[PDB]
Design a protein around this motif. Structure first.
Motif, short mmCIF file in Angstrom:
data_model
loop_
_atom_site.label_atom_id
_atom_site.label_comp_id
_atom_site.label_asym_id
_atom_site.label_seq_id
_atom_site.Cartn_x
_atom_site.Cartn_y
_atom_site.Cartn_z
N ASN A 1 40.49 32.77 33.23
CA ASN A 1 40.76 32.69 34.67
C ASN A 1 40.28 31.38 35.30
O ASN A 1 39.84 31.34 36.45
CB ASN A 1 40.20 33.92 35.40
CG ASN A 1 38.66 33.96 35.47
OD1 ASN A 1 37.95 33.19 34.82
ND2 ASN A 1 38.14 34.88 36.29
N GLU B 1 54.23 39.38 28.19
CA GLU B 1 53.70 40.49 27.41
C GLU B 1 54.38 40.70 26.06
O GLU B 1 53.77 41.24 25.14
CB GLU B 1 53.82 41.80 28.19
CG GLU B 1 52.94 41.88 29.42
CD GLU B 1 53.62 41.36 30.68
OE1 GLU B 1 54.75 40.84 30.59
OE2 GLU B 1 53.02 41.48 31.76
N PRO C 1 49.49 36.73 37.71
CA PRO C 1 49.62 37.98 36.98
C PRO C 1 48.84 37.88 35.67
O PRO C 1 49.16 37.03 34.83
CB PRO C 1 51.13 38.10 36.73
CG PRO C 1 51.72 36.75 37.10
CD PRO C 1 50.61 35.82 37.43
N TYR D 1 46.36 41.92 29.94
CA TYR D 1 45.10 42.46 29.45
C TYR D 1 45.29 43.32 28.20
O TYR D 1 46.25 44.10 28.09
CB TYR D 1 44.45 43.30 30.56
CG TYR D 1 43.26 44.11 30.09
CD1 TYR D 1 43.44 45.32 29.43
CD2 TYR D 1 41.96 43.68 30.32
CE1 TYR D 1 42.37 46.06 28.99
CE2 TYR D 1 40.87 44.43 29.89
CZ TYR D 1 41.09 45.62 29.22
OH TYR D 1 40.03 46.39 28.79
N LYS E 1 45.97 33.59 42.91
CA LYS E 1 46.23 34.82 42.17
C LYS E 1 47.29 34.57 41.12
O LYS E 1 48.22 33.79 41.34
CB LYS E 1 46.67 35.94 43.12
CG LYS E 1 45.53 36.50 43.98
CD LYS E 1 44.62 37.46 43.20
CE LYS E 1 43.61 38.15 44.11
NZ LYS E 1 42.37 37.35 44.33
N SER F 1 51.77 47.52 31.79
CA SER F 1 51.16 48.27 32.89
C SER F 1 49.70 47.91 33.14
O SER F 1 49.13 48.31 34.15
CB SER F 1 51.30 49.78 32.65
OG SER F 1 50.67 50.16 31.44
N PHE F 2 49.09 47.16 32.22
CA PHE F 2 47.74 46.63 32.45
C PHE F 2 47.75 45.28 33.16
O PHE F 2 46.72 44.86 33.69
CB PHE F 2 46.95 46.52 31.13
CG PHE F 2 46.82 47.83 30.39
CD1 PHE F 2 46.68 49.04 31.08
CD2 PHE F 2 46.82 47.85 29.01
CE1 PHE F 2 46.57 50.24 30.39
CE2 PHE F 2 46.71 49.04 28.31
CZ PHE F 2 46.58 50.23 29.00
N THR F 3 48.91 44.62 33.17
CA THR F 3 49.07 43.37 33.91
C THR F 3 48.98 43.62 35.41
O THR F 3 49.81 44.33 35.98
CB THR F 3 50.43 42.71 33.63
OG1 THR F 3 50.65 42.67 32.21
CG2 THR F 3 50.48 41.30 34.21
N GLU F 4 47.96 43.05 36.03
CA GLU F 4 47.82 43.10 37.48
C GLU F 4 47.46 41.70 37.97
O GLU F 4 47.18 40.81 37.16
CB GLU F 4 46.78 44.15 37.92
CG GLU F 4 45.37 44.00 37.34
CD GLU F 4 44.53 45.30 37.39
OE1 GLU F 4 44.06 45.69 38.49
OE2 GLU F 4 44.32 45.92 36.32
N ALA F 5 47.53 41.51 39.28
CA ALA F 5 47.16 40.24 39.91
C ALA F 5 45.66 40.04 39.75
O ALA F 5 44.88 40.99 39.81
CB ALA F 5 47.55 40.23 41.37
N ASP F 6 45.25 38.80 39.52
CA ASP F 6 43.84 38.52 39.30
C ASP F 6 43.53 37.10 39.71
O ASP F 6 44.39 36.22 39.65
CB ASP F 6 43.48 38.73 37.82
CG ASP F 6 42.14 39.45 37.64
OD1 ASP F 6 41.09 38.92 38.07
OD2 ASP F 6 42.15 40.56 37.05
#
Length: 372
Positions: free
Chosen positions: A347, A329, A204, A207, A202, A186-191
């Motif tokens: 990144n 994950e 995934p 974190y 972008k 649930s901490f994995t977001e697009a970055d």
């Protein structure tokens, strides 16, 4: 009580690692993008071949692979080690490694019975006769063995086959291990991921804020982050500073350098951003192996008389490795703490090294420029 053989493999491993770094150097010259290959897996295939040769052919392979001191050990020590290192890994339920090899030879040549059994016993390679002169057919059977023996994981590996081909070696390595410490999904977001000063995409981005082990090389100004796996395997992530060029590092990667990184490691409470991705990449290696000094194996002058006594026709046509890395994950079920944590944020392009710790064998060496 059979871990001690991984610990004795440390010398085969260290030499195979050097070979791996020399190869990544060679690859680095020829092309600009993502890179993944298994020095371990490739040297199973190459050593299996090495035993099939003699003269300069053999000598070049020993020197190309840095296994001259182990080829002077006796005829069965190298194969006996590879048999054990492979089987130990293979039977490790908690290691996320799958490895295998194939040989495909033209029907024209008979395989000496000694080398056939030796290859199948020690290296788990069965030399399969194939009629290349009908490649439509040939590709069918070749692609069928692979997809079958790899239980579906490697479908349709060849899209095309040359009818002239005499002998193909195929190695494969698939790794998808669980982290010792999982990322919360649930901490994995697009970055943002920066391909260069101009292009970003972008990705995934996983974190975690928790206990991490890393070190900082002051000479190269890069972080070396340990991400431990189940089954005693570890990924080192090598991230340089934006100011510097990650391609320059490859000129300097050595077994010594990595040992120095390991020795300065410390465990800190840290923020880590690491993208989830997958590399699936098939490599034509023979033309690179040529560049490293292994020339006679792939020529008409090739001495393969210990494989087949009949022909001077015979030579290695192609050497392919199929590599698959899968990062996500999924994980298993004294700390320097600042007042607020630092962060290693991966990144932009970076190198990774997946190695097994007792052996120090190098399961995957690679460069990730455009994640997938």
């Amino acid at each position: 009580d059979e871990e001690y053989w991984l610990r004795a493999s440390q010398q085969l491993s260290n030499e195979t690692s050097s070979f791996g770094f020399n190869l990544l150097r060679k690859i680095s010259m020829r092309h600009d993008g993502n890179v993944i290959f298994s020095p371990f897996g490739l040297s199973v295939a190459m050593v299996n071949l090495m035993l099939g040769t003699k003269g300069e052919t053999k000598v070049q392979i020993e020197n190309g692979l840095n296994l001259q001191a182990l080829s002077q050990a006796g005829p069965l020590i190298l194969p006996a080690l590879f048999k054990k290192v492979k089987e130990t890994f293979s039977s490790n339920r908690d290691l996320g490694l799958s490895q295998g090899s194939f040989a495909f030879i033209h029907k024209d040549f008979d395989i000496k019975e000694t080398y056939f059994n030796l290859s199948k016993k020690y290296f788990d390679i069965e030399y399969v006769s194939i009629n290349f002169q009908n490649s439509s057919q040939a590709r069918g059977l070749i692609n069928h063995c692979i997809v079958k023996e790899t239980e579906g994981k490697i479908p349709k590996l060849f899209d095309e086959i040359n009818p002239e081909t005499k002998l193909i070696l195929v190695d494969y390595v698939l790794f998808k291990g669980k982290w010792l410490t999982p990322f919360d999904p649930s901490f994995t977001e697009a970055d943002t991921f920066h391909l260069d000063k101009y292009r970003a995409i972008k990705v995934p981005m996983m974190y975690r804020e928790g206990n991490f082990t890393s070190t900082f090389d002051k000479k190269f100004r890069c972080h070396i982050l340990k991400l431990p796996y189940q089954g005693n395997a570890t990924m080192l992530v090598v991230l340089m500073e934006k100011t510097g060029d990650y391609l320059a590092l490859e000129d300097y990667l050595t077994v010594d350098l990595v040992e120095t990184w390991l020795q300065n490691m410390k465990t800190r409470k840290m923020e880590v951003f690491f993208p989830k991705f997958k590399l699936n990449q098939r490599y034509e290696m023979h033309e690179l192996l040529k560049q490293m000094g292994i020339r006679r194996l792939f020529s008409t002058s090739a001495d393969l008389s210990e494989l087949s006594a009949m022909a001077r026709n015979l030579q290695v046509s192609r050497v392919l490795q199929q590599s698959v890395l899968e990062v996500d994950e999924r994980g298993t079920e004294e700390i320097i703490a600042y007042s607020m944590p630092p962060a290693i944020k991966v990144n932009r392009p970076f190198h990774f090294i997946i190695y097994e710790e007792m052996s120090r064998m190098l399961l995957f060496l690679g460069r990730v420029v455009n994640p997938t």
